[model samples]
Target: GKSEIAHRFKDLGEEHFKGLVLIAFSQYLQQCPFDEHVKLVNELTEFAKTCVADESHAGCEKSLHTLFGDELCKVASLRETVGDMADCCEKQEPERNECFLSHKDDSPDLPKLKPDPNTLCDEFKADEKKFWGKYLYEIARRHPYFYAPELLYYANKYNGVFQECCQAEDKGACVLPKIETMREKVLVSSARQRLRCASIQKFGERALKAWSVARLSQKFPKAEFVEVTKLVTELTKVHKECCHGDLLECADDRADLAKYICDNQDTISSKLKECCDKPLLEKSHCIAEVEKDAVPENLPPLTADFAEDKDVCKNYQEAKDAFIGSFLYEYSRRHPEYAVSVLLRLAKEYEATLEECCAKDDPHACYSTVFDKLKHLVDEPQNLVKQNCDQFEKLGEYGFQNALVVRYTRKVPQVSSPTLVEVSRSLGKVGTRCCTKPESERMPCTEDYLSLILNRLCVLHEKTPVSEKVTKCCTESLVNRRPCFSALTPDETYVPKAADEKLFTFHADICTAADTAKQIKKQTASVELLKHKPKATEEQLKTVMENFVAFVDKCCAADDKEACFAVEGPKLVVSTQTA
Candidate 1:
């Protein structure tokens, strides 16, 4: 059938026939599900076969109209376009394809009309399948650059909203507010995507390529640098084509990219192998959502020359986006705990600072100060995690869980007691698992696990409303959610105990002899010390713990052990206070 169609359209040029068929199929696929694509392809082939058998302008026009007539007439502009194509079909055989190609270039813009929310619900309620088909078409035509997955995301958002609101007693009231909120969310998401596309257009692919190389290198630090560059080059090519609104070309390139990565999974990061194993339609999104790998040990910290040198302005001026990209790349590899949103914020701040500083007589002087402030911003979260992990180390599994529950409960009093305990327990598991890793691996392990915890919270609370703070945090991307949760302030309305009143007191039984008794005693003493003096340095705590262990040994060996404990336990408390 394909060869016959090629032969039939030989006078019109085989290339033109292939191009036209592809365009038609691409449009058709927009309004159909991925599962329906093969059926549509088969139908198209049958249409081609029928045309080839007759080879008349009338037959060709009739076959085309029969296939797309209903969809083409759904909107007035499309109907008019079809009418123009019909006129082209009447031309002689040699002129027919050119006539059609000219009319294709004269395609009209789709009207950006959004029907009333009530009307949308009504339409959906009347015929669910038909509504989604038209809905997909509307979104797909408007967002020509969006990949199939993105189009589905857009459609599913509306599908979910309508499914909920339509079931409400007061459908109009329920849907209006939801529709407004959804519209804003959609606009924000689209704008962010468009901004990336705009960056590609303004800065060109080289800048983005550099940025991707840095990002992928940092994300999969264990992978060879050469392998990451190879992946980035292909990814940049895909982004360049996709961002230019070539959906068909983008899909083809993406498929090739997926295959390339999958075939060479051993060389590329092994983490992507699972995503690549997914079916074609699901592969891209799966890869997008994979967590960054843990950074390896002994990597050098980002140097001042990279971002703070006098040549900063010179490098930035030469390749504006690429310079910033390189800086982010270096900074992120050093500090994987900083989330993507935080990094983006830092990038914006860096760019703004550069603009101001570069205009001045001494750019380095102006930027160095601001850059230090940015460093402090990144350090604050790192320090927060460090402090938590320090407590986790001092407190063993049970004690850490206890401390986490109390801490989270005090910080977020608005949370239900059960949920507070659940979240704390979940975090406790992460602490117990990650805190036990070697010192070098601890931070990344904790950071990655914490992000996973937040991701779980977001997914569990996807439909249900949590507290305002939690809901807001959950709205952030997977990488950013952990930082968002970390930055949440304690509830102002909930007053916690006074600092001195929060001191720890261990039971006397903790000193009793048992299996691993000495180890238990030491851990109990460490936990109590940390609880009482949360501000004490690890070295100070270590010194106090050693003294406490020695004191316990002396007291436990003495005949009047109870009397020894009575005198010395108070001394240990005093030592903690002083530490």
Candidate 2:
């Protein structure tokens, strides 16, 4: 009887729900597999459990189906499972329940526990988006200066995509669903917060570094030398902000930090000098992790196979056996009061070892490794995950489908990506902005003004042939097929390339600005000659546009692709990071 209402829409098919729901889901339907027959059968998957018993909720379910499709919500069983789990969690696991819900501030962490970085990351890497912020909570609260580029990268990547997907359109008519919109905002916020961590952390570090550098300079360093030290301090913050968003505590003094150890440059430079040779770096990082979590209880057992970096099964066995030595010894030494904590430590260490295996570029040996076998130790042989062993096996089968793609992502073609196009299109048409301070207000407006300048310059571009090479100012008021004051197309589509996407792009706007300057210069020369007035005063309009163009070009002329341009015309001149 309960399941009947769930399948009522499925029983009736698309025609019945058309007037009631499913319209919103139409856009997502395009991305669904061709065999996905659930579009016609509505399901209220995200909010399914809360209203599962209410027959009246059917209309809303039908609507979401129209927008996203039944397949998207077809996690009917999963919904039930998660719902029941929540219900059970509420009853038995009071602490987990508190953290899972609004009582996040009240939840207590495991006492004196610091998660091993490799293990924490490797285990959760399977579905990182689900557990990122939680993991971050652990990192930020426990160790103050941990390096975490991988975590930062994953956070930014997911949030960036989630924002784009939130803004997706089906046919230029239908927009993303409200749920999608909310998810997108969450993702964007997560990404922003993830990035904000480094800077926020650096803000704390900068003051301390400055104070330390200033205070310690009496140890025979110059007052002016403090400035260079200050520069290095600032540089550490900058590097962290750029490379890892907020994940890393600023290494503001990498060279200085290294000098204490390497006698020359330090760990980073040494690795770079060696062309990032994986063997040396891998061993170095392995030892680094061990030292970072000194006396960590998760040492795995040592065996004959231990410490063997063999590519084959025998070597993998050795590596795993050795990796597990410390943990097993601790488990043998400690009281049962810490057994749970000890076991979790083993899990983290094994996770790190598996990651190392992956890093060595031969993950087929993963299953053979001790750390990996330990990571996958299921308590109950009859558990669902154990039953579906094939699924995990497939993970191994498809692990290294493209070593080249992994090795060389810099060559990932920056094509006119659909996500960037959607972001640009929305940016142009929405006219609504969502950022802070003067720059946010000025960016779109400046972009609009620049677009006009570019359009005017383009008129000159259209007039001059590509082969023509001239660089003189003109004063003739160049008239065109359309009037100078003519209104733009109804959609008003004049966004420069780099500013279109929120993520990254090539040097499109700067190039546009240069083209605009060239056009303005040519017009000034020709127009000035045509009017027979050499006096610069009479050519005021040409001068205004020319200066504006020159300002943009000079500001943007560096060959670096990420350069931003600015011009003070009738509009503002605030700059932004390349969009």
Candidate 3:
């Protein structure tokens, strides 16, 4: 890991000062006891901050060299690491100006976002649980390498104080002061992003300064002052470089300019109309005049006017369903095997039934009888592939059909059973195509097909929790018909959004509750077994065990009974005791 770390640091630049920042920390920690490492890290972080504060990194390098050469040099590992960093530090003059200039074009010129009057604590206090989960998740996602662990620690510590204040009957009145303090000291103080932006701004300033000093035209033959006249004269030869751009995109008589235009139509429409209405010379003059006042700033985000416009928003849902229906019909033509329309009709019925049946507080009877009608609609294969196939040739019979039941039964939200049915049917077509290859060539055949379909389905739907009643009805619908529908879960590797996290959390809660109930049932089973244990004496138990083994040995037509017993004998053990 250290060797890989050293290699990445080397790639940053030949004369990278940042490598020394890491080197100094490692030296600071090499001798520290395990308990004090956090404190050591804290102090070391402050030192790195101090290094960046110095205008010339020469000062930072000198300080690191002194520390490494004297106090930390005695540590063997520290000696080699610091030695490598020192080499990175030397020959700074030739590289410093070039390094900063190279970054100038790449560095973001992001506008300084004006802070809201309400502090971080003020927002967190309003929704205590809501903020921390999002806060931790956001920090971990954006800055996991170093900042997440510390931020999480500080967040927990803050929450603890806030909760204590709430319990003390002060009702978070005392928590206000603590929050105000941490809001400044921890949350605001620890914002490395602000520091980073400032560092880049300073770098740009220094780079320009270096360029100004390095050029000799200023000092020679009183050319510095006179050169200004030559520069002004050269302006006549300057040419404009046009980009893929807008002309006179404006508001309130002022022209708008920006890197990207969100809605070029809204921006250019009136101007274009006015320009087109004018004679050619007049239009050119208008553009030339407007160009003088153009100022570059981002346009406000475009929004549809339909939110308040009833005529447009009206019956949008019916239109949406119409489009979906149209698409389904277009898709169904190619695949005659899928009863797509029938599946959709059944789904509409399911929705109507689910809404009414699951409404009453005590509605098990409603749910229990809900799926009896759809029992015939759901189809089942006579035999499904579970393990290895006898021959690859017979795989064609079960190949696509086996995967279809599993894929379509996935509980994808916002999609009707009919929509899912078609997709599953299409996936089956692909899987059968895959299985047509030589035996080993069909690797990742069904598993890959199912995963792709499931992943796409999860992405297409906005997450909605599947209610217990809904799950029960769905499960019962599949019972004695097809494979059971497991609710389609988002793969965290692909789908790590907060919505998916909430969905995963909801699913986890259901499973955890079931696990707790199962644990109790297991304990009850133990007690029931204990009651039965005393009914058999030790002699009776031994005699029963011998009879069970003898019966098994005698019953088999001997496809080698020992081989079967060796694998299955664990099941015959009297795991529950008589004594």
Candidate 4:
């Protein structure tokens, strides 16, 4: 009799009604867990009540089971109180509805929007490519909140490799989903806390702008869109003026500007309420959230630490290119005037000793050696100049001109570097026309051009003790002097060594300068020598000088300490610290 009564409720609809009811129930259960059976059944019963006879209670029950019977039987054990679904339903409280199908942990029985990682990446790449300018803006408004963080992961993991793959083969052939092309548009703020705040704020702007678009005019009153557009425009207008159009600089500066905007939100929202009749808190939140990206979270500064002088060389060796590159970039950004000057200065030094040092098997030691020699000048502009001088003599007669460029550039940068580099380049021009005849003819031809150029630049060749040998060699004819001076060279790579007469023997005469042989002596004390002679005997002194001569012979090309001491004794052997 009850089954016949249920038949009447089905009579209210066509025979196909049962099938539609079953399909709807199955679709709902697929999205939800089996744990939600009783609540879902209760809701479905109420739904059938709305669509059927008021007294057809059994018909409602009959309909649910007929639709759900097979699905429930698969988990038959779960309803018996010991299974996962049984425990879930038994523990359900009164206020809770059917466990909303948590998309979190997936089950084989449920409909899943969750995708394989590769599929997820491909879809994201397609979206990015399809809507670049509009893409980030739309996603900022409507996409999954988790999408930005996931995009960041994809970018960091696959951008470099994908870029390489695209180069090796066509981008379509890349194993990674197409991502690198839109890299420049990705949210650049790196840290999670900072990125979240910025993305949310940017999303708020996109949402506000979406509300102000033409399609919304039919839905929302004109005032809501107009007021928001006005407020946002005024705020950003001030922002644009403050940043001066440098994107990197502006983004960083916005962090600070965001705070100031937040502080004045109450004042700003009052105007919005007046203009558009919006609630104060709603306007406040809208303005505040939109400005969130602007709030500055101080990123850890990019730095290279090698402050300790002792470890400076060692650290530089470990990260030589990084240290040098970052040091110049960081230092130049702070002092732009010195940027070009410093690099140009170092290029000249690389033209000399560091080129070998950099290429050597032990760049660490090679860099260290040169660093120690010129560490004193590290803070000075003339820092790298000393290294270039060590190799200048090799540039031939033009080498002297290169050295002059260094001297004058250091003395007066605007005048010297510009004029001297020009003259040095033009020397070949002069040489082509001159220096082609008899000794007398070639000498004057070259001299007139060289002297005139140097005089025009206000450079008078000065004779230091080191250059005196060149001066004496100049007394010889141009033929002999060319080789004589060619053999002579800048002695010190970093610091100038004292003039040594023994090293200047190429001049055929002793190098007698203002600093005499007696004045240049380096003496030392030894009890063993004193035990033999309380005072130095002539023979004992002679032996000390001979020992020093052998040592001096081993020193650099231009060192003259030995020849100076040859006439005296080991007096100059003592450190120059004391009286």
Candidate 5:
């Protein structure tokens, strides 16, 4: 582990920073006792803030100044504790243009993030629960040598900060303030996209509105941030009101709702009017522009006016494409077709999902954050491959069947062979055919997304297994259904967005299958005892039955089997998933 750590972090390239960060984070903790380590974290977190005080600005270059500004924002945002946060955030930026230097100065890698090799800090928090968990975590996980210390550093740093914040006389009020005091690094995500507009103000306004709604904090208050918070202590009985559902106020210009959608049709006129035919974008087809409203289900019906209004539609197309092109493309070469659609869907779904799963009106972009967390856990190249395949293969037998049927029939077999390269190529060819068409026009549209707990992806064939050579043209396809997001991608590069219901069901199914398969193979292997097989112990048989029952429970437990998988083994609290 140390060798890998050395290999990864010893060299100091920008690419090598996370490894270095992990290493520094390690060295800072290697020698300290667990209790002292935690104390150091608190001290360091607060001290780290001072490293980038307003005083640091005088010495900084332009880029460093920008880093300082961002760090200031971080402190204000409470994104991270200050001292190291400001210095570390600016550690790598390199336009240090102090052209008028009075004398030659030598600072080994000016503001170098190089972690000294000969250092160690080892300590634990005083808390019984945390101490045990940290100790056991180090024992159970075969992590990089530096991981324990780094984890401890952040764990205690954050724990200390938050605990103090909560202890502030105004506990709830001070929480955000404490967060505001931390310094952090901010990088604009490549995943972000915007409206393409000649009428800049129109789409710009719409985009800002979306961002406002998405991150409504910039507009609304902490109090109004939540729709569900029972802020109104009491409701008074008043005179009779015309309690109309705002149904009569559905006018185009002044009504609050009408403004939510794009009125700018001319913005995307040229992109959609392209005369290119389907099946011929040279292995890639793109919807240049689309309306944002076109993304969701039943926002407003796609009238002839809506579809003909090319700009909004093109912007919508770009939103989905930007999602695919941004994060999914990282894994798309492995499962081009489905990866794009899945990520794009995730990006699109993030709105509703954020509303459902995360705090509304908060600036913390939840979808990307969710993906970021899952990626940290499973972002190795191999995991990414597996995730892509699983996303494609998640659709049940029928979804794959439909997709395979179309590819085998309509498009030329780009990668007919079962080789790894061929499968990705095949997916690309398949996507070039299917995805070129509008999603609404595509077969087995969103209606079929639920067959595999997300039939839409199933039809996209994210979970479709790439097995069975096509040496024989068998008309009837074999069906082997697996839960969504659970099965590992044979490709290994695939990673998941956080564990969702569909993902849990997939895990439960795999567990059950593994158990059943193990027993079946064990039974079959006992050939000599076939005739005299000692009557199977009731316990053994019972276990096998239990595995089967568990599998079925995930499949049919009120149609969304994800619940069965969510609360499988009790580690902390049992989390039950509801639709």
Candidate 6:
């Protein structure tokens, strides 16, 4: 009889046993205003006592109905999924909780459900507390797996958006796009959680712990390994527990971790210490954006035991994620020039190589020359930087700056004219400052200055979005910045607008200019033409420049040079498009 009872219990899935009614109620309570919590808890406690005392289906249903009223499910935003809740109420008392748990699969299609901006603002203004409670409830129900801290963060952001938008003269116009952006962020955060959960599922907790340690160590290079390990262990534990869909446990764990980080700031890196000073809500974002520490001099030389070891395949097969994570930690600390993206790429390549080699009869032989291929991969950025520096040397300052303006304008045509010119000038200043140094010092000096420029660009980009290539390149390390920028492919989708006539028209002062001034004017004209016709092939641009110089020579020598230019300038402007 005991065996049969155990078998019957096993037939019901674990989901049914996890107390879904309590889980849903917990979510509901978490979304409500903080001050109402005790009152709600007391109410729930009394209801629980009544249900326990009277163990009848009518008693349970009546109590639950009082707790979750008909009006709760009637709200338009709550209508769809709350309908499922009402259906669960129809089930037998013994089966009702399971019915609620089974309804978890009915997640709403979030992106399509548009909330009326005016209605939301009006509702929010009418009763701030009730509005926030309902707002959070809608968000929390849609994202059932989100922890309390995550839900709170979303609530804060939405509140800020509503406050700003409601005061605007055009309320709908101000709110709609901001609302869309917020929704997009929610989708992204949800996707990120899904990805982290997936990695945890595949690699197990220990491997993810290793991965987190490696990532944090790379970000905080100056921090001691022991300190990084301690912080990462706690963080990994939080993720491990939270990823299992335990909302309250996840919230408590995250709160504990936050307190520990703040209290023990001295034990972590100085960067984290600064983040600890921020308010609790802002601390997480501040820490995430902490600038990486410069790599210390005392670190060990880079090694590749993962590639060289004969048992690499065996170790990888046993614990693939840990093996990769350990390899990244080892390599990345020594070579601080590599961005996280670059390191991930290298790790992926190495893993792919290992897979192919381990399949062979003579696996050791297949692995023998792998280091050479990896070395070539690492050397790609250096080759690109060398090529760029060589060009800078050949062109000198003024000419190099002009070339940069043309090249960047062609590459990122969406950028405003002034912004492109400013970037070009800054890059030119780097060349002027660094190229004059001794040959031994030139490359490092150039790289250091280039990094400053890229850093500024990144800061500006945080406020205003730039082209994809520029954004990607700027995110790399100081040592890798030059190479990353050098390798950018042009924005192929960008079609340059019509040429500005003012740029093409020559001033009368050109006729009376000294030889030096004439040369400057000619170079300036070439730059303007290239900027105007950004898509023009090198051959096309060359033809246009040749025609302009020919016109200049003929027009400048004429008796009435001003008259000569007036007729010919329009022709030059016409040639830009026709060419």
Per TM-score, the best of the predicted structures is 6
lDDT against the true structure, per candidate, is 0.56, 0.31, 0.32, 0.33, 0.27, 0.59
Q: Estimate each model's TM-score.
A: 0.40, 0.18, 0.19, 0.16, 0.21, 0.46
Clashes of 6: 0
Candidate 3 per-residue lDDT over residues 84-143, each given as its tens digit: 333323335434223322222111222323323245446666887545443343332222
Span of ten consecutive residues with least summed lDDT in model 2: 467-476
Query: Higher-lDDT candidate among 2 and 6?
Result: 6
**TM-score ranking, high to low:** 6, 1, 5, 3, 2, 4
Worst 10 residues of 6 by lDDT: 1-10
Can you tell me which runs of candidate 5 are displaced by over 4 Å? Answer: 1-298, 303-579
Q: Listing every candidate in turn, what is its Cα RMSD in Å to the true structure after a full C-alpha superposition?
A: 19.3, 28.0, 27.2, 32.5, 24.1, 14.8
Error of 3 at 489 (Å): 18
lDDT minimum window of 10 residues, candidate 1: 99-108
Over 1-579, each residue of candidate 4 has an lDDT whose tens digit, in order, gives: 243224423542322222222222323233233334434444443445454555445444443233243233344454452234444433333211123112111112323232244443354456432222122222222221222322322333343443355345344456434443334223222122222222223334332222122111211122233343444444343233221111122222333334443454453333222323332222322333231111113422322232223454455567654445434333322322222323223323433444566566665466545534433323442322223333443444443443433333322222222343554444433444453444423433443343333322222222212234434544432223322433444333223224343332222023343333311222112211222232334455445545545544443235565544452333333211111
Say which prediction, candidate 2 or candidate 4, comes out ahead on lDDT.
Answer: 4
- Residue 369 displacement (Å), model 6: 4.7
| Lowest summed lDDT window (length 10), candidate 4 | 95-104
lDDT of 2 by residue, 334-391 (tens): 3222222223334344546656665665565553556446533322211322222333
Clash pairs, model 6 backbone: none
Quote the lDDT for 120 in model 5. 10
Candidate 2 wrong stretches, greater than 4 Å: 1-295, 298-579
Score candidate 4 by lDDT. 0.33
